[PDB]
Subunit: 258 residues, 4 copies
């Protein structure tokens, strides 16, 4: 099977990567970073995020696995001492799929992005005001720092810091959370996080300023002359290679409780 | 079609109820409060809640409709001036189903409940401490005022006041929110609301005191010698008669924004 | 100097208490639990709370000291291994004063309480609705689970779990926090915690039900036929014997961060 | 008395300003925008903020008054229809003082600012990590979007959106609130807002990146090679001319409740 390994680039990760490649050399496995069927990320969740975005055009043909050389990750959920066991098992597994978020940005005179964690919108030097439209229905006028749209697996990330709910990645949904919304006699937002099912479309529409700083996972870009930002649950899914049970809620416990 | 009408019991509601019955008298419709196929609730959400619990043993055979004589309700979402139009249309509609929550209470030496909004657990005079177990995995030891498990339609109720997320009722899920959790160097809870898919089981297990005040929607009972409280998404669903489009998110907007 | 020692009543605490009494026997110190000038509490914050309430009528004549036999407390902030050192130093110190909360309860056809942590109000079986009046000005109609009024030192307790701010006990103030407030198009509360200076009076006035469950620190009582609940910063203060520097913010760090 | 009037610069405000100047012409009053003793701001809170910062070097010699031509402001708390009455009364009042925040920024190889609302710190393109030090004691390592330090009158502004408490401006204090803090098994912040008395010093110290976007009220500047950011309650106070009673809590009610 064609495979590749990305590394965080520190000593520990590169040596682990060389050792796994050497071990893969003892099996019918071809290193190929152009059309891999297996993508191993060694590092942290940041490293895994880059791996996903490197190959986001071949998601349906790839199964991902993350090894954590630092602390336990939500995506990089296997330990280095288990690398040898991982080599063997991979050589000869079930696949687990998580939902992704599609962001569409439209301009004047169109770009789409795929997120594994979340997409966020803030202003580019000035007050952030957008009209929030759900399935063509005007829902609210949002004034604040910005907004965040999370995938289920993303809910443990930025979404969590914003008071969002944690949702099991088996739920095909996206979650919208507010950043520092203004609420007074005049201005009014829902306050609560909002969880949207598949096929629902959330559109953000500029009121005055049309420039926005938009993020998708790690990447943050200043967009100019924006007419609309559309969020929806993607038709695409990320696929993980599963070798043993490590339940999401146990992953949550291990990361946040103890 | 067999039908019945419950009233809040104030003047406005009883007169509206008598008028609809009179109007139903002009069609092939039989009043029957034992085996109705249609249950009309006239009043508020509290009135609708009682209607649901009155007939919770025939949910699969009943389509519910709520008329709001006071303010707009999430369940009682039609206006009194539309009663005549409702009579006609009902006489000769699509059905919309929402998920429900199953609560199981086990003792020493077993009772099950169905909730349309939520079930909550608090202590009966003393400190509340329970072990939270998700699919047989110990997740956290909760210390605080109590816990709340909400259906999707319930998310706009008690759940919302506790910082929970609002979720579209098309999502088959339940949501657990904390009431005043203690978090310090010693005690540790997740903090965030948790959203569970169908088939996941959340079990609350006593640590010391075994007496608990348990609520299901409007009903609140002191339970004694409790060994376990199990929450899961019910196999049963509530069915609404749908006569026109009134999207959940528009219902949310109308109730909270303007 | 006249002194007494209260114990949590477990083995560790009673033996520590007997040893300190024996050690005090080597100095000019008289055990007197009627008119002590020094009150030593051995146990946890709960034990210290009881010590305070046991002698709340002689606060101006007493200096308190807490020893923690369990985990570190905010009031019981000295370790058992330091008991001998405490005996000596006490025998031959500076005094530190913290603000207290006065609760007044008025009826039909008047009772006052002093709180070291907080006073809370909830309903006694039913919906909680009160009108909140600040210095005779109607501020809001509160609908929810209840309300909590905290002293500065209390801010690390129940107040913290409710999203309240932590405030240095050198600030003569009280802080009002909400429990699960209902906010929609119809009902409206401030949401935010409110911090009141000395001489401001917060009055809670019943709207419908006049029965309330009122707590002051550890004690919780059902009050009947209530006409008003008044909160204000007390003229009285609790006095601590200070033997070394242990800054409030360090106490906060040690208890919550690490 | 020497005086000046600043305007928002819209039609309504300029005409109101010309009319008040004309009316002042009927009294012993000299327009002087260099050394005024009275500064009238006509517009909104933004306009008032600029007025304050225009004259922040003569705060002890100036009494401020705000007129709101748009919605009611916390600083601009008088209505246009009352301009004539204001002219008269000012011609021949009590003074009310609010606390201010001092921000000190130190570099490598020192700048101080005065805030009426708040000062905030965020990163300049990258992860925000700072060590929070209170009176020379290391309190926490903060990871998140940023931090906000509010004056009492500022507590109704940005501070409120971040979950901060509202505090009466008679309390000489500052309040620190978190923006989207990361909390997991590894990283740990207090969570709660923190209220500091006069003479307490809060120092933010860089961990890695030394570039920060720092705001003081309306002004936001990228600071380079920062070694420390110090916050403390200022010795300086803003003085308002008071003509009638308009209690802070009533101002809060009018702005947020109804
Ligand atoms: C910018 C930046 C770094 N912040 C990322 C932190 O969040 C973590 N993270 C990334 N993705 C997730 C995630 N999906 N769930 C929980 N934590 C996550 C990452 O491990 C790190 O702890
Ligand atoms: C890991 C990693 C790489 N950083 C990207 C992730 O950082 C996470 N993040 C950024 N800011 C915060 C934040 N302020 N709190 C928690 N997570 C955050 C966010 O989820 C994003 O996907
Ligand atoms: C006890 C009590 C009364 N509190 C109930 C309030 O919440 C409302 N309520 C009941 N169910 C829901 C609901 N499902 N969503 C939003 N509000 C709801 C009810 O209308 C009323 O406004
Ligand atoms: C309507 C109605 C009947 N009351 C029952 C409902 O009241 C709701 N409720 C009770 N307490 C609160 C509350 N404190 N905030 C918001 N909703 C609440 C809860 O959802 C429950 O189902
Ligand atoms: C009922 C009950 C027990 N909950 C009390 C918990 O809060 C603690 N507590 C009591 N007073 C304070 C306090 N003033 N600050 C922080 N924690 C406090 C006590 O130590 C224990 O951890
Ligand atoms: C200690 C001790 C004795 N218990 C009394 C204290 O418990 C504290 N408390 C009660 N409930 C909670 C709570 N739910 N969260 C945090 N602290 C709480 C409260 O401050 C009260 O003064
Ligand atoms: C950037 C920007 C605009 N946001 C400012 C909003 O907050 C308001 N504001 C400014 N200062 C305060 C303030 N001190 N209290 C409450 N609101 C304030 C201002 O009126 C406006 O409503
Ligand atoms: C008014 C005015 C001028 N804008 C400055 C003020 O805007 C306020 N502000 C900026 N962002 C927010 C915000 N996100 N929510 C509430 N208030 C905000 C902040 O207090 C600042 O002093």
């Amino acid at each position: 099977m064609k495979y590749m390994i990305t590394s965080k680039g520190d000593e520990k990760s590169d040596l682990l990567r060389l050792n796994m490649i050497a071990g893969f050399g003892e099996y019918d496995m071809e290193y190929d970073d152009v059309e891999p069927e297996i993508v191993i990320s060694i590092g942290g969740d940041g490293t895994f995020l880059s791996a996903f975005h490197q190959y986001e055009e071949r998601l349906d043909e790839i199964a991902f696995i993350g090894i954590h050389t630092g602390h336990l990750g939500f995506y990089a959920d296997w330990r280095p001492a288990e690398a040898d066991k991982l080599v063997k098992l991979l050589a000869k597994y079930q696949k687990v799929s998580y939902p992704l978020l599609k962001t569409t940005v439209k301009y004047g005179i169109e770009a789409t992005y795929l997120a594994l964690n979340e997409s966020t919108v803030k202003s580019s030097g000035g007050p952030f005001v957008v009209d929030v439209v759900i399935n063509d229905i005007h829902f609210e006028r949002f004034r604040g720092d910005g907004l965040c749209m999370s995938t289920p697996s993303g809910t443990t990330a930025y979404n969590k810091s914003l008071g969002g709910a944690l949702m099991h990645p088996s739920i095909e949904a996206m979650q919208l959370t507010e950043m520092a919304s203004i609420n007074n006699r005049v201005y009014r937002t829902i306050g609560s996080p909002l969880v949207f099912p598949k096929h629902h479309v959330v559109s953000l529409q500029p009121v005055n300023d049309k420039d926005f700083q938009i993020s998708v996972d790690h990447l943050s870009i200043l967009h100019r002359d924006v007419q609309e930002i559309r969020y929806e649950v993607s038709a695409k899914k990320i696929h993980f290679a599963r070798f043993r049970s490590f339940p999401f809620w146990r992953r949550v416990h291990d990361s946040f409780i103890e």
